[PDB]
């Protein structure tokens, strides 16, 4: 199937409590594989998946050095952002960054990404052409002009089409037993009376990987989107995910309702119903 690699950075200022904290995490698909935390007793890029542990000391030392440099860059960026927004040095602010590459089932670059935010709002994004920028406001336009003058997009393009894809392919091979294995959902429907004339039907999907899934209820074959309570997909802690979808139905009409499950690990979509037995 398709695969992606993403790095996520969070830089958080905290005046009076030291320099801004910098946390970086890396993911392949829904599997985290590295972390770095400037607040750690000894900050280092550290493995978070078994298949990355085989990388040598040059990998770990170099990623640690690079993440330390990135932390310094983002501390500077926090100071710059204060200037661009006319903000005081007393408040706490957050810069976030996400970047990486998507491969199609073929294995070639499908597209690249590099997006930044300030205080939870879009700030600047590399366009899909990997050559131009979209700035969210007049401050980000200052950054855009600077990055155009410095030809930053060309370096990002080179990284996203080269090293990003090459390393993602390496990880997918080294982690193939997990990264290239889809675990289908284990599914079932529960029934919980609400009153003498209504009952909740809850369709459960458990133990699935990757996280992407579709759970829907139909009544008489029509989607019940506006009447379905759908919880956010949530991590189980063993790499897998969980989700449920629930509808409240008139007692005696339960068999008119069907739950439909789509997941990459299923050869065909599942249809299930409440089974009183």
């Amino acid at each position: 199937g398709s695969h992606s690699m993403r790095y996520f950075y969070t830089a958080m200022s905290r005046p009076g409590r030291g320099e801004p904290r910098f946390i970086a995490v890396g993911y392949v698909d829904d599997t985290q594989f590295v972390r770095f935390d400037s607040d750690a007793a000894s900050p280092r890029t550290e493995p978070r998946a078994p298949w990355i542990e085989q990388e040598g000391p040059e990998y770990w030392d170099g990623e640690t050095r690079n993440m330390k440099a990135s932390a310094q860059t983002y501390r500077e960026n926090l100071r710059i952002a204060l200037r661009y927004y006319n903000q005081s040095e007393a408040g706490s602010h957050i810069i976030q960054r996400m970047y990486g590459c998507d491969l199609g089932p073929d294995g070639r670059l499908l597209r690249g990404h590099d997006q930044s935010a300030y205080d939870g709002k879009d700030y600047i994004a590399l366009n899909e052409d990997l050559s131009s920028w979209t700035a969210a406001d007049t401050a980000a336009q200052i950054t855009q002009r600077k990055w155009e003058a410095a030809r930053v997009a060309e370096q990002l393009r080179a990284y996203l089409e080269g090293l990003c894809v090459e390393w993602l392919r390496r990880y997918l091979e080294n982690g193939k037993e997990t990264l290239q294995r889809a675990d289908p959902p284990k599914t079932h429907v529960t029934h919980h009376p609400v009153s003498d004339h209504e009952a909740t039907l809850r369709c459960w999907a458990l133990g699935f990987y990757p996280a992407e899934i579709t759970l829907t209820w139909q009544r008489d074959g029509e989607d019940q989107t506006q009447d379905t309570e759908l919880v956010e997909t949530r991590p189980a802690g063993d790499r897998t995910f969980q989700k449920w979808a629930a509808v409240v139905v008139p007692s005696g009409e339960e068999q008119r309702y069907t739950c439909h499950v789509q997941h990459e690990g299923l050869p065909k979509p599942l249809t299930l119903r409440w089974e009183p037995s």
Partner: peptide, 9 residues
């Protein structure tokens, strides 16, 4: 492997 920063905001 992570991107090497070279420019600020």
């Amino acid at each position: 492997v992570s991107f090497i920063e070279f420019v600020g905001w």
